[PDB]
Design a protein around this ligand. Structure first.
Ligand code: ZN
Lengths: 241, 207, 219, 329, 331
DNA sequence: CACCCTTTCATTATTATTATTATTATTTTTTTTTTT
């Protein structure tokens, strides 16, 4: 639960590929795991092909991939974990809006790991930190790290309900982009400019960009109730093995 | 454009609040300011008017006030005659005041050649006064055609050129000291936009 | 001396993904001051703790600087900045036929590789940034006077500091604890905003090798 | 080391902005739905805090070119004008990662974290070009900083806080330029116009009936293969405007300032913000203030002869082996 | 080559501005509502930073032809007068997608984002025409870069640095020109005039009754569209001096020779629009090649290396490069 | 061997917009120079 690579041996039980070298000398961190490779641990030399564009988010310059990372750099891991929720018991998919609602409102209690793809697939499994505390959450989205506070998210939900009590048509207070790519992602709507209090407007700017991206998922017209993911740990294991 | 062309220059904030429209009220107010400059002068003074009418009005307001000290340039008084006159009065120890125009704006050496090696004691021109921004001072055929092509950009451009040539009378060599510059046109201190170039030459002096 | 720094900046800066400690900023200013003094070829880990900032020690080691993360008072609405990295395919074709370039492959790939056009959107804030710290004044003054910009990706010109003011304040008036510190840190300093995470507490806050369990606030 | 380059865009500026921006037949931008609205990519714009009109600052639009585009333009002008000719004369050639680090600054040479020794870090930052644009796998710090091209405008008046109130623009900065592609098989019409076609008359008529059927299919769809007719808009910055450009070098070598100065000398044949076909980004340099003293002439940079001499010795000393050692190892 | 060409329009210039503009009968553009207004189709305007007064720098409207427009015009002159003549004196022929690529840039919409080979990009940018107009489905960067047509005007002083202070206009630069569109059978006067119409007087009088019924319908709506449409359109005045800056980033000599041979065919071409009203005719009065004046009244009388290069490249012209340019990777 | 190429995964699900606003109209009177 301390490193992202702990989702290889504590969940999704896999062994080394056994074409991997054993580490010798003064210990260094893995390039991808951020985990120190210690003497007697299995590593591969960094055999990343030239298409690998996540060199920017590498932890260290060791050019040494830990074996857990080698499993994380498998493609079934890359597309399988593209839209899933990681917990100490198993993986849940965060693809459903209600799955997202369940993640940012009443999250699971375990030290989980939240990974979401801005494209078809990228390498985001080994570059996001694990979330020891439910209150502060590290979300990987595309190539950008994110922080969601669930308490802030529920509070923003309560206001989006509260200004929308008693009117037939659901109007969002503030636009958010699901891809978080628009210039207006974060900008308050004119209807929200009139239905938004001075403290509320300054609160809604005060949220971190992860919560902006989160509240894009659950801020639409049909408000999603928090519903637990369907299991993907067995699917990922089947796709890996 | 060296620093020593503007370093001895003394810039005063005092001016004539009346704009020059060839009116009597302007000429009395500008004559009062010119009398103030002449009183604070410890040497020769050249005020530079644009038009003959402005010069005639100033002369009628300053002749009895300033006595023998006044020099006027007119139809019967050339710039060279008043040049030798100005040098003669500075030779005699009294402080002359000059109501100069025409060639007094451009192309006159107001530095002492009786003081070649010592510019620190050069005192032929202690006070230079600009009574009006020199607009419309060239009326040649080629320049009127060029004005007709370009518009007011040519006129404001040539007015800035005549303004810098009138301002070049103060410093003619390095080493001079305590040189006084005055501008009394009220468009200098108004918020009008078209007189904006005459700010930035004015911005090269301080205090 | 128990003082607050506020900084007002001209261009908008990139909105920091994770809380940025003031101590991290002044450690970089000390590193660049050393690069001015002791030349380019110097190890930055020797000077990035040489700070005019006091040190809070956790009960089991785990010392952090007495600084806090910068809190944002937004003057402008938040926006998102797109930037792309695209290699010039046309220039590369000319250099390939000319022989200056030595690439065997004849086809580019915008999905990945050398010629990967790539588009990324980073959050942007223009604000006033406030940080609490415990520390002497004049070293912080000289450092922040050397400081030109704030925010990430400065090579494209973001977040230039228009000015800064640094002034003393009361002992109870400044929670400097709004900062990533070891969880073993004393309770007085951990508030409800602090939470457990894989956070850096010191020095390079991007060094994932040095990352460990920590109680940190959210930006 | 601060360089302030003030330029005047001879042709308009169009730095394309993300988003599906919408515009009516008139100038109304992003109309409410239910009206006839048209696609539109505007120029890059940001909300800046300007102290205009009163003592408070407000978020006003300010349309510029991003500093990433400008850093890339400076990098490419050095590459084509200085690095290309000097390197080409020697006879040296660049590999995959050498060209990727020189031209893109990307880590595709080897896409893993290169551990760089301090001696290598000191001499490549002491190298001119690698000092200016470090990056790629070695992850090197750039000595050169590029600020974005800010126009001399009321909205940027606090960014240009002192010495820029003269020749300073006010009011609207952008204008919608409309572009229509149309079908040229609509613009035929003589028998001499059609003999150049494979299939000729029948091929052109088959194109016509395909366009007709596509039009009827679209009309029935409203109540995926498109044609060639395309009427669209793009918002551009107006030409003739003076832009500022801040180039800050963090403790440079002398050859680095000489390289930036040679780029500013030879930059006149290169363009800003794209829009190549419309020939947008054409510009002329009005001034270059090196640490505040004006050094730009109409015929290049007059002065800074130590910079020119240092970069002359450097580009005589320029070699691709330094690029390869910056790339691979 | 930084080609600068000054062309004197000898008839008005009408590159129409999209929008919904109106004008009263007097000639006030876009009047306040309630007054009788007629639709006005203005010429193409760009706002330009210009020197009004001295340092009061302002966005004024300057009336231009778009760079996209005159770029298309440059393409069509070379395509009409150099490329396709030299393509049909031999047996080469073009597919309809490759004609659409040679004229509109692309054979269709919906471009393939799959890029193109480096040997391909190099061979198309070494082509005389394709390197100039780099369209295709895989989007090339063409090396021809065409300016908007600027009138040599006091509002374009910042655009045109020096050398154009003489022969430079000022003030208002346009004229509103009105059109009537008179219904033709109202002009009908006798049985001799009406014999070509089927039925003669009965059909003419029937359309007259239709027009009066539509007039009652219009009077009912105020308090199916006829052939009386009296409107206005704003043109740029004739005889103005304009500047045109062609730009070529490291051209092959054949490519600038293609520009110069196109310029040779620039005469008897129409700039902007108004083809019924002869708008857009012009005469080139100057061509400069790197600032060197290369235009006589007979023709170019210069740029000879580019001329023989484009000569050798147009007997070497064939349809294979055009077809492999227009070929779509998905299709 | 390094490189260069071809094809697998996910299923999300509404979609606010910046409502900012857009094409002009101001001076003014010298008197030089040193050529045929
Ligand atoms: Zn690893």
């Amino acid at each position: 639960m301390r490193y992202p690579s702990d989702i290889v041996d504590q969940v999704l039980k896999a062994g080394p590929d056994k074409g991997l070298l054993t580490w010798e000398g003064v210990d260094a961190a893995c390039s991808h795991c951020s985990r120190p490779i210690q003497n007697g641990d299995l590593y591969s030399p960094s055999s990343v092909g030239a298409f690998f564009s996540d060199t920017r988010d590498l932890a260290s310059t060791s050019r040494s991939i830990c074996w857990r990372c080698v499993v994380l750099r498998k493609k079934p891991m890359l597309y399988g974990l593209s839209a899933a929720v990681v917990t100490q018991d198993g993986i849940y998919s965060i693809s459903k809006d209600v799955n997202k609602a369940w993640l940012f409102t009443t999250p699971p209690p375990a030290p989980f790991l939240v990974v979401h793809s801005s494209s078809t697939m990228q390498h985001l499994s080994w570059r996001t930190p694990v979330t020891l505390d439910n209150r502060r959450i590290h979300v990987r989205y595309g190539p950008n790290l994110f922080i969601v506070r669930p308490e802030v998210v529920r509070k923003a939900l309560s206001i989006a309900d509260r200004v929308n009590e008693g009117q037939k048509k659901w109007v969002t207070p503030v636009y958010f982009d699901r891809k978080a790519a628009a210039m207006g992602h974060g900008l308050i709507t004119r209807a929200g400019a009139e239905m938004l209090t001075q403290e509320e407007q300054e609160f809604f700017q005060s949220v971190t960009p992860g919560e902006r991206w989160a509240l894009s998922y659950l801020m639409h017209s049909k408000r999603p109730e928090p519903e637990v993911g369907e299991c993907i740990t067995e699917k990922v294991m089947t796709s890996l093995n | 454009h060296p620093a020593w062309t503007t370093a001895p220059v003394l810039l005063h904030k005092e001016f004539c609040a009346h704009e020059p429209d060839d009116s009597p009220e302007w000429a009395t107010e500008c004559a009062q300011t010119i009398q103030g400059v002449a009183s604070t002068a410890q040497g020769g003074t050249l005020v530079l008017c644009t038009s003959y009418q402005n010069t005639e009005l100033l002369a009628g307001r300053l002749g009895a006030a300033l006595g023998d000290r006044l020099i006027v340039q007119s139809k019967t008084s050339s710039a060279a005659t008043c040049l030798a006159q100005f040098k003669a009065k500075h030779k005699a120890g009294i402080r002359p005041v000059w109501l100069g125009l025409g060639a007094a704006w451009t192309g006159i050496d107001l530095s002492d050649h009786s003081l070649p090696d010592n510019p620190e004691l050069d005192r032929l021109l202690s006070d230079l006064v600009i009574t009006r921004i020199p607009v419309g001072q060239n009326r040649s055929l080629t320049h009127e055609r060029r004005t007709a092509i370009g518009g007011f950009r040519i006129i404001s451009q040539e007015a800035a050129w005549h303004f810098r040539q009138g301002l070049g009378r103060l410093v003619r060599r390095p080493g001079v000291t305590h040189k006084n510059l005055w501008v009394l046109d009220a468009r200098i201190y108004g918020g009008a936009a078209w007189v904006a170039p005459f700010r930035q030459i004015l911005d090269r002096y301080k205090k | 001396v128990n003082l607050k720094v506020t900084i007002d900046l001209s261009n908008p800066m990139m909105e920091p993904g994770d809380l940025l400690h003031l101590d991290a900023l002044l450690g970089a200013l000390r590193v660049s001051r050393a690069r001015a003094e002791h030349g380019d070829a110097i190890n930055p880990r020797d000077y990035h703790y040489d700070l005019p900032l006091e040190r809070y020690q956790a009960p089991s080691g785990d010392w952090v600087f007495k600084a806090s993360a910068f809190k944002l008072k937004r003057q402008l609405p938040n926006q998102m900045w797109m930037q792309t990295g695209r290699l010039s395919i046309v220039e590369a074709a000319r250099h390939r036929q000319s022989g200056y370039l030595q690439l065997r492959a004849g086809k580019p790939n915008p999905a990945g590789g050398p010629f990967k056009t790539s588009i990324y959107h980073r959050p942007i804030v223009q604000a006033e940034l406030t940080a609490f710290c415990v520390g002497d004044q004049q070293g912080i003054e000289a450092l922040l006077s050397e400081c030109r910009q704030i925010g990430g990706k400065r090579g494209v010109g973001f977040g230039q500091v228009a000015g800064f003011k640094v002034e003393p304040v009361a002992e109870t008036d400044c929670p400097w604890s709004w900062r990533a510190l070891p969880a073993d840190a004393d309770p007085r300093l951990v508030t409800s905003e602090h939470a457990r995470c894989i956070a850096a507490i010191r020095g390079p806050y991007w060094d994932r090798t040095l990352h460990v369990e920590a109680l940190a606030p959210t930006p | 080391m601060q360089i302030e380059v003030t330029v005047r865009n001879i042709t308009p500026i169009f730095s394309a902005a993300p988003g599906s921006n919408y515009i009516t037949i008139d100038g109304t931008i992003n109309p409410p739905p239910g009206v006839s609205r048209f696609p539109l990519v505007r120029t890059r714009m940001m909300y800046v805090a300007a102290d205009v009109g009163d003592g408070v600052i407000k978020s006003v639009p300010l349309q510029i070119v991003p500093g990433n585009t400008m850093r890339s333009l400076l990098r490419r002008t050095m590459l084509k004008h200085v690095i290309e000719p000097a390197l080409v004369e020697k006879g040296n050639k660049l590999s995959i990662g050498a060209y990727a680090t020189a031209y893109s600054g990307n880590a595709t040479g080897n896409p893993d974290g290169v551990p760089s020794s301090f001696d290598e870090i000191a001499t490549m930052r002491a190298h001119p070009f690698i000092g200016l644009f470090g990056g790629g796998p070695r992850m090197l710090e750039g000595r050169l900083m590029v600020d974005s091209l800010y126009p001399i405008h009321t909205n940027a008046e606090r960014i240009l806080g002192a010495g820029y109130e003269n020749e300073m623009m006010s009011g609207p900065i952008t204008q919608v330029v409309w572009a229509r592609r149309m079908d040229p098989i609509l613009n035929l019409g003589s028998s001499e116009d059609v003999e150049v076609i494979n299939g000729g008359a029948v091929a052109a008529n088959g194109w016509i009936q395909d366009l007709l059927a596509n039009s009827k299919a679209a009309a029935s769809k409203k109540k995926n293969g498109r044609g060639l007719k395309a009427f669209n808009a793009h918002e551009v910055v107006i030409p003739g405007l003076k832009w500022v450009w801040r180039i800050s070098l963090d403790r440079p070598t002398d050859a680095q300032v000489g390289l930036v100065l040679l780029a500013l000398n030879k930059m006149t044949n290169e363009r800003i913000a794209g829009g190549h076909s419309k020939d947008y980004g054409r510009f002329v340099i009005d001034g270059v203030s090196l640490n505040g003293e004006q050094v730009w002439s109409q015929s290049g940079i007059t002065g800074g002869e130590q910079y020119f001499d240092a970069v002359a010795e450097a580009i005589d000393g320029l070699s691709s082996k330094e690029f390869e050692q910056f790339a691979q190892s």
